[PDB]
């Protein structure tokens, strides 16, 4: 559908568990590369509707990051019923597209 900003660990947990197929984009406002790929990720939220697209600010929602083990940005993790199944790092659009079709083409 589109991309929303999550602002709590419960909300992140609830949305993924109940929604089945979920991709999530861990970003930082101060992060150049993360910003560099933000537009393109907004695009895929529209085209590939066979998945849920969301964002987490790693500074704001501290608890989430200190659990998914986020150590760099942007980090993309895809989920299945509630469990991470894949994870990508970087601002390479081609890589990201390659990733999303792998689970949502």
């Amino acid at each position: 559908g589109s991309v929303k900003i999550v602002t709590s660990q419960a909300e992140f947990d609830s949305i993924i568990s109940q929604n089945e197929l979920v991709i999530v984009d861990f970003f930082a406002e101060w992060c150049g590369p993360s910003k560099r790929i933000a537009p393109f990720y907004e695009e895929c939220s529209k085209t590939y509707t066979k998945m849920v697209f969301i964002k987490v600010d790693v500074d704001e929602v501290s608890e989430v990051t200190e659990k998914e083990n986020i150590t760099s940005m942007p980090t993309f993790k895809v989920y299945k019923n509630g469990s991470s199944v894949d994870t990508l790092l970087g601002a390479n659009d081609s890589a990201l597209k390659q990733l999303i079709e792998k689970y949502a083409a």
Binding site: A28, W30, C31, I70, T71
Partner: protein, 504 residues
């Protein structure tokens, strides 16, 4: 006995973080607290302590900003560069500096997590010789408690604004505020003459602001004074004004400006007053009274011995908050790390505070290691120490023929700037001229001094400098052919250049 953690540390700055991470890597269960009580003007920031947020890191960044500007204004035309409408945007600088600080905040946090250190953003004090009370996110509604086999206090320091100056605490900013300021600093009065005062005056001036520095007595108190004057003179010749012996006595809020009444009864209007006279140990809200821990009450610093022990056998202090320890990040790191190894690795290394290199980032830099000339005399006897030295001009700057800023111009003929650099070695005659003091004023002093501090540590003698081949053309090589001594009486002034209104 049993505790929740083997090591609880109070403070997430260089020392506290370093000690925590070492302790962890040797098996200790470790908890670390960090909380930033806002500044006089309400400024706050992330984890990492003074260094990353409101000290070394942003200070170096803006020094670069200023240095850059000096290059544009003084040197660029000479080297063939042409441009129009040079102006500096303070807002942009601040955002580039804060973006970076915010990235280091994140990385210091994920580093703690990797090393398996639990970090709690909470205000902390101690209830007991093995117990610490805390308050999540500053909120004093719920005090929670935790126990530790050993407690490390590493809360560091904050800037001091004096009590006896009306309107001071209320109207003036400090180093906690300068690097994130929302308004252009504009016409700025800096009060104090420590390395922090001089560094902020310097970049602010180079950035283009009218800058005044108030100094009771001497500048860079505590450092070699020949070098001190050299730095001072250089800043003066670039525009900064030094109100010598004249401190503010009263400050009055007056719209978007501040009026300052001075102890000579004069008065003047400024956009910003920046107090930078010193720093006191952040110790007050720690409840150390209720353990009878001895602290030096003038400093507000904890009295810790050569093992980082207080008088309470289970509590320790390192870094800025311990009395008699140099306020340098790498120093707090080494003591933090050595402590952790002593507590959890049965190490018997003790921290060495001698020959610690330092480097000040004024528009012309000053690095040093060991004794000043004055102190080596007192300690050893003037007739027993040799000082080899030499003033000289940096090659690249030399070819520009810079001119004094008007304010430093005696007469309309006093145009050429003074010599830019100084190299000076302080040596012990009765020990084959063992160098016990290194001093260098000029560009890139941090980079020059590091290797030389290492040499001093290896007990280098003057003859070793003379037998080393210099690297040409460089500022550092001046140390490797340094033969003019103080006692000989011969001229150590810059040889050549177009100074003194004549080239030759």
């Amino acid at each position: 006995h049993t505790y929740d953690y083997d090591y609880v540390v109070i403070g997430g700055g260089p020392g506290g973080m370093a000690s925590a991470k070492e302790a962890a890597a040797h098996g200790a269960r470790v908890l670390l607290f960090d909380y930033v009580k806002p500044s006089s003007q309400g400024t706050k920031w992330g984890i990492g302590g003074t260094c990353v947020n409101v000290g070394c890191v942003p200070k170096k960044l803006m020094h670069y900003a200023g240095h850059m500007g000096s290059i544009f204004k003084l040197d660029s035309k000479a080297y063939g560069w042409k441009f129009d409408n040079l102006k500096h945007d303070w807002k942009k600088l601040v955002t580039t500096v804060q973006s970076h600080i915010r990235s280091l905040n994140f990385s210091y946090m994920t580093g703690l997590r990797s090393s398996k250190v639990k970090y709690i953003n909470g205000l902390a004090k101690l209830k007991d010789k093995n117990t610490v009370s805390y308050y999540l996110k500053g909120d004093l509604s719920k005090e929670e408690t935790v126990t530790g086999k050993y407690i490390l206090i590493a809360t560091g320091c904050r800037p001091h604004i004096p009590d006896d100056v009306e309107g001071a605490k209320e109207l003036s900013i400090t180093s906690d505020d300068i690097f994130s300021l929302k308004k252009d600093p504009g016409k700025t009065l800096v009060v104090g003459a420590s390395y922090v005062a001089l560094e902020c005056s310097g970049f602010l001036n180079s950035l283009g602001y009218d800058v005044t520095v108030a100094v009771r007595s001497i500048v860079l108190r505590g450092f070699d004074q020949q070098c001190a004057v050299k730095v001072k003179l250089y800043m003066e010749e670039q525009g900064v004004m030094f109100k010598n012996g004249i401190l503010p006595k009263k400050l009055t809020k007056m719209d978007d400006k501040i009026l300052v009444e001075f102890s000579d009864k004069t008065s003047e209007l400024y956009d910003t007053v920046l107090y930078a006279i010193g720093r006191k140990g952040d110790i007050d809200g720690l409840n150390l009274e209720s353990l009878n821990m001895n602290v030096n009450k003038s400093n507000n610093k904890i009295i810790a011995d050569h093992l980082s022990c207080t008088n309470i056998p289970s509590i320790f202090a390192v870094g800025d908050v311990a009395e008699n320890v140099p306020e340098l990040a790498p120093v707090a790191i080494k003591a933090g790390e050595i402590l952790a190894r002593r507590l959890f690795k049965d190490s018997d290394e003790i921290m060495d505070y001698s020959y610690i290199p330092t480097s000040i980032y004024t528009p012309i830099e000053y690095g040093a290691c060991g004794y000043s000339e004055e102190k080596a005399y007192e300690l050893y006897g003037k007739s027993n120490v040799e000082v080899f030295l030499q003033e000289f001009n940096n090659l690249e700057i030399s070819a520009v023929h810079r001119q004094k800023h008007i304010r430093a111009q005696k007469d309309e003929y006093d145009l050429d700037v003074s010599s830019t650099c100084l190299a000076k070695l302080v040596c012990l005659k009765n020990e084959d001229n063992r160098v016990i003091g290194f001093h260098y004023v000029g560009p890139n002093a941090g980079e020059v001094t590091q290797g030389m501090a290492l040499a001093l540590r290896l007990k280098v003698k003057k003859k070793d400098f003379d037998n080393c081949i210099g690297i040409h053309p460089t500022d550092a090589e001046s140390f490797m052919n340094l033969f003019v001594t103080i006692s000989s009486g011969l001229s150590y002034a810059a040889k050549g250049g177009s100074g003194g209104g004549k080239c030759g």
